[PDB]
């Protein structure tokens, strides 16, 4: 990484994160760094343990994509930009063949 120190501290931290997941948390006193992961022993919540309210919301539009196109500064080239593009046949077999591309950098 290169951190342009002329940027703000808040924006620099926000840019260091979102590159590996990450979420700075100030709860319970300390600063805790948490990244996305899968566990074989998660905490079991039944709906009867809740307060009775429940809101389900799935925004498949504007958030579900079938293919990704990314770019990066690759030292294989003379530190120029290289594009990584690939599709998924299963995700396009689903969604009735709609063409939706995820753009990343």
């Amino acid at each position: 990484t290169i951190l342009d120190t002329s940027e703000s501290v808040f924006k620099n931290v926000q840019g260091i994160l979102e590159s590996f997941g990450g979420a700075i948390n100030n709860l319970s006193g300390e600063y805790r760094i948490t990244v996305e992961k899968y566990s074989t022993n998660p905490l079991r919540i039944n709906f009867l343990d809740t307060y009775g309210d429940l809101d389900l919301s799935d925004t498949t539009g504007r958030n579900k994509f079938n293919s990704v196109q990314a770019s990066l500064v690759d030292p294989a080239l003379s530190w120029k930009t290289n594009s990584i593009t690939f599709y998924n046949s299963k995700f396009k077999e689903q969604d009735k063949g709609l063409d939706k591309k995820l753009q990343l950098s």
């Binding site: 703000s8 808040f10 924006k11 926000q14």
Partner: protein
């Protein structure tokens, strides 16, 4: 309904209430004068 008139009589409060949730992150509404 008749809520439009009311909101039009309390616009500055709406602006402040909006800018108070954007300051949670680093966003703020004073960045529109550039554009």
């Amino acid at each position: 309904a008749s809520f439009r008139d009311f909101a039009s009589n309390n616009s500055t409060a709406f602006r402040d209430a909006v800018e108070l949730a954007l300051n949670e992150n680093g966003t703020t509404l004073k960045s529109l004068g550039n554009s």
